[PDB]
Write a protein that binds this ligand. Sequence first.
Ligand SMILES: [Mg+2]
Ligand SMILES: [Mg+2]
Ligand SMILES: [Mg+2]
Ligand SMILES: [Mg+2]
Ligand SMILES: [Mg+2]
Ligand SMILES: [Mg+2]
Ligand SMILES: [Mg+2]
Ligand SMILES: [Mg+2]
Ligand SMILES: [Mg+2]
Ligand SMILES: [Mg+2]
Ligand SMILES: [Mg+2]
Ligand SMILES: [Mg+2]
Ligand SMILES: [Mg+2]
Ligand SMILES: [Mg+2]
Ligand SMILES: [Mg+2]
Ligand SMILES: [Mg+2]
Ligand SMILES: [Mg+2]
Ligand SMILES: [Mg+2]
Ligand SMILES: [Mg+2]
Ligand SMILES: [Zn+2]
Lengths: 112, 63, 77, 106, 50
Amino acid sequence: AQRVTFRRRNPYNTRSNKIKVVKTPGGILRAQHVKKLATRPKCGDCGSALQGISTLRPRQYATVSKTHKTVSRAYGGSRCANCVKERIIRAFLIEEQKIVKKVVKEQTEAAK
Amino acid sequence: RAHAQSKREGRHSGYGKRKGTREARLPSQVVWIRRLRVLRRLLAKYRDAGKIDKHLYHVLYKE
Amino acid sequence: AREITDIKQFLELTRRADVKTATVKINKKLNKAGKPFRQTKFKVRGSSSLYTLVINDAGKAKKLIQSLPPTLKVNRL
Amino acid sequence: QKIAKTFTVDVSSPTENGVFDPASYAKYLIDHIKVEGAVGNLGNAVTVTEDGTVVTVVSTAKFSGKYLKYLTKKYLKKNQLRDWIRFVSTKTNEYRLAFYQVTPEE
Amino acid sequence: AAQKSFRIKQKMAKAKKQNRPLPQWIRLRTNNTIRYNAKRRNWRRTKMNI
RNA sequence: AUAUGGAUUCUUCACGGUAACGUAACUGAAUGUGGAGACGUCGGCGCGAGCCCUGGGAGGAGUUAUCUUUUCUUCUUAACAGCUUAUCACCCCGGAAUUGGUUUAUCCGGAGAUGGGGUCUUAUGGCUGGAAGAGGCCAGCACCUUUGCUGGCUCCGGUGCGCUUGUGACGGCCCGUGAAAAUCCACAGGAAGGAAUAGUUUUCAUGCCAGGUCGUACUGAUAACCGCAGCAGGUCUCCAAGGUGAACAGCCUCUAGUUGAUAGAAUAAUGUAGAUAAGGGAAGUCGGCAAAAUAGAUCCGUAACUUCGGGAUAAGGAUUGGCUCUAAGGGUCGGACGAUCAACUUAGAACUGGUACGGACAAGGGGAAUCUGACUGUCUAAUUAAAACAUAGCAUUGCGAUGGUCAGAAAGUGAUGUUGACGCAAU
RNA sequence: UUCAAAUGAGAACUUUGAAGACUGAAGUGGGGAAAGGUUCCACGUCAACAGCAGUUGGACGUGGGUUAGUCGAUCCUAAGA
Ligand SMILES: [Mg+2]
Ligand SMILES: [Mg+2]
Ligand SMILES: [Mg+2]
Ligand SMILES: [Mg+2]
Ligand SMILES: [Mg+2]
Ligand SMILES: [Mg+2]
Ligand SMILES: [Mg+2]
Ligand SMILES: [Mg+2]
Ligand SMILES: [Mg+2]
Ligand SMILES: [Mg+2]
Ligand SMILES: [Mg+2]
Ligand SMILES: [Mg+2]
Ligand SMILES: [Mg+2]
Ligand SMILES: [Mg+2]
Ligand SMILES: [Mg+2]
Ligand SMILES: [Mg+2]
Ligand SMILES: [Mg+2]
Ligand SMILES: [Mg+2]
Ligand SMILES: [Mg+2]
Ligand SMILES: [Zn+2]
C-alpha cells in the first residue's frame, strides 16, 4: 500500500532509470535504482561466453585483479579452450603439410 | 473471510454467479500443463524406482 | 565493515599504527532458542574499514578486554 | 506441549478505592473462561484464584493475555467501569487495573 | 524549470531585487514628482519573457 | 607519491588440476587482434523481489443491549563486505537399435546420447559483519519549567494459474533482421630490465593526500504553464490497497487528500435533464427521428452464399438464488499401500424462499434484399469521413554511369547514390 | 452541507472541535519533464483584486530559505550544424 517515487529527476521509464522496491531499517518502502546488468565476455573465434571470466561493466574491469579476467592458458581470456585447441591442431598440421609440400616440390623439380 | 469460507465449502459458484467464460475463469492450457507434468513426474518416478523398464517408459511417455 | 575471527589478527589490528579507537558492545541473545547468554562485539575503527570480532564467551571476552592495549581508546557499552 | 502458564492481575488500586470486587471478578473469570469452545469446561485445566489484591490464572490449555484482557474488559463493561478503569501490562503475563487520567475539580 | 542556467538565474535575481515599492523617504524630498513605482512587476501579471 | 607486510627468485619473472579450470599476488615497450559499451517486437513456461491473503505469541486501541478465546493495529533491517548459492555452457570415464533422453511448446545423440563424477558465469537467494547502539510499539517519572530522565517487547511460521516488476532458457515474425562514439579490459608479441648475501613484484593487503564551476525552494494545473483571466479547453511521464466481478470496467471501502463553485425562501406556466403509463401497436412522420426491446455466463442447436479461410454470438430454444451434501481432478516422504499437507475448478443429488435469482451495477436487437467501394488505413483543425485518396496485385515508358529523373547564380557544386535492371526514375 | 466555541466592529465563507459526505490507488494521493520565477515559509496586514462576502488568500508590506568527489550539466557521439 506504500507507494514510491523516483529518487532522481528523470521521470521516464528509460533503460538507465530502472528501480526496485526495498524495505529500509526505518520500516518504510523506498525505490532503489538498479544499474544495467553486465554481459559476459565472448570468444573471439566462436562468440560463446568465456568460462572463468568475471562478468562486469567495462569500467569495472579496471578495479579487479588479473585472476578475475584471465585463465591460465594461452589466449586465456580472449579465446576459449576448444578454439585454442583447434588452432593448435591446425597450426601443427599445416606446418607439417608445408614441409611435405616443399620436399615434394623439390623432388619434382629435380625429376623434371 | 466468511464469504471465502463459504466459497471453500462450495457455495456461490453456480451459473447465476459465473460471469466470465470457462477459459477466463480457468485456462485449459494451465489444466493441461498440470496434468502432463503429473504424468511425466509419475513416469520418471516409476522408471527410476524400477517399476517399469525404459522401453515401456518411452512408449508411455509418447502416449 | 569486515568481520574477523582470528584472535592474533585482532590483536595485530589493535596494535596497527592507524588504529586509535575501539568499541565494546554487549548483546543479550539466545543459544539454540534456550537460556539467555551474553555476547561481546569488539569493533576496531580502522582508516578504511571497521573490524568486528564476536565472542560468545563472557570469560574470554573479559580476558580479551584485559589484554587490550592501553593506548587504544575503548568505548564501553 | 502443556507447559503451565501463569497470568497475574493486580486489582489493588480499584479495590482500595472501593469500586471493584475481586471475588466477583474471579467468579466471572471462572464462569466465562472457555476451554475447547465451551464454558464451564475448566476440569483440571485452568485454575483461577484471588486473595484481595492479586488474581492468578494458571492454565495449561490455550489461554493468552489477549484473551484475559478481553474477558476483563467484558467484565468492566458489564459493571460499567469501562470508561474509567483499564487493563494494563507491567511485564510479561503480569497486569494491573488502572484508572484513567482524572484532573482534580478544584 | 528546476534545472536552470546561470544566465536565467542571474536575470531572476535582478528581477527579485527590483521587485519592491518606493522607499518612503523618496516622497519627502524637495520637488519630488515620483509617487509610485510605475515599473513594478508581479509573477502573475506580466511575464518576463526570459 | 610512496612504505611495510605478503608473494616470487641461486631452476630468476608462481604453483596445482588428466581436463574444464583454481588462487590474495605472480614484470612488460612498439605493434596487431578480440571482447565489453551495444541494442526489435510478440507468446507461453521457470525463478527472484515488493505488494496481496493467513496462523501462534507479546503489546495498544474499539465494541460489549445480546453474542463473538472478538475487530483493527506494531513486531522492520540500506549501501557496502566475507562465505556460500544457477539455468545455460564446458571437461573426464564410457560406447548406444529392443533407439534412448526430453520441454507446456519436439528437439538432441558415433561430429559421442543416456549414466556417473566434476568445472564455470554470481542475475538471484541464504548466513554473518554493517546492526540494534537505529527505527517501531507500550509502560512508568518532577514541573510555570522554552529544563531533564527510567524501564519492557521488538519473536516464530504458512500459502498461491494472485497483482506489479526484474530476469533466464526458449519459440513465432519480416522483400522490416531492428545506432554510433567516448571509455575499459584482455590476448598475441618480447624491445628490455631484474637476484646471492641479496633482488624483483604498487593488477595482493594495509598505510598517506586531494576532488573545482553551474543547477538544487515550490507548482506542475477546474487558481503557480499556454489560451488578453484564478477560462468546464490544451499540455510528456513513474508508484499504486480490500470486496464483487473475466477485468486498471461499473459500485462500495482503507491510507492520503478535499468538502471548493454567491446564498436564503417558495414550488405557477414554459423549459433543460431524467422516468412511468390502461386498451390498441407506427394508425404519427418526408422518413420508426427519438425511445423501447436485446444483452453476462452454461447447455442444445445454427441457413443461403463463399476466395473453403468465413458467414457465426447467424437464426431459434432451455437455465441461472440460497442451503445441506456427494464425486472427480494433487504435492512431500517411506518401502499392493501408508503418514502428512494444501488449492480452486467442474459435474451431480436432496431441501428451501419466490411476484424478481447476470435481482443494483454491468451489458449484441435480429432477419430478407438492392446499389456501391476489395479488405485494414487516410483528408477538408473550425459546416462535407464519402462512392473521394492510399493500398497490395496488374500494365506501360526511360536509363548500362561519357546515363535516366531532378537541383544550384556559379563553382574543383548537389539528391537518387553506403545505388546498378530481382535497380532507380515517370505514369 | 450542519452544530458549538474562539477571533473579530462585523462570520454562510477564518481557526479548532463535533457531525454528514466525496475523490475510491487509470485518485480530488505521493513525485517529476517542459514552462513559470519566489508563487515556497514566517511575521505584520485589508485601500484595490478573489464577478457574494471575507477577520482568509497564489492579494498588500517586511524578511527567511535552495549546502553534492558519488544526483544532473559538464564528457561522447546520433539525424544533423
Ligand atoms: Mg483468466
Ligand atoms: Mg489451447
Ligand atoms: Mg526539492
Ligand atoms: Mg515538488
Ligand atoms: Mg498564464
Ligand atoms: Mg500571450
Ligand atoms: Mg401504453
Ligand atoms: Mg403511415
Ligand atoms: Mg397521416
Ligand atoms: Mg448474415
Ligand atoms: Mg472502403
Ligand atoms: Mg470539417
Ligand atoms: Mg464531420
Ligand atoms: Mg480509388
Ligand atoms: Mg462516484
Ligand atoms: Mg464513494
Ligand atoms: Mg467580491
Ligand atoms: Mg502560502
Ligand atoms: Mg508576498
Ligand atoms: Zn571459441
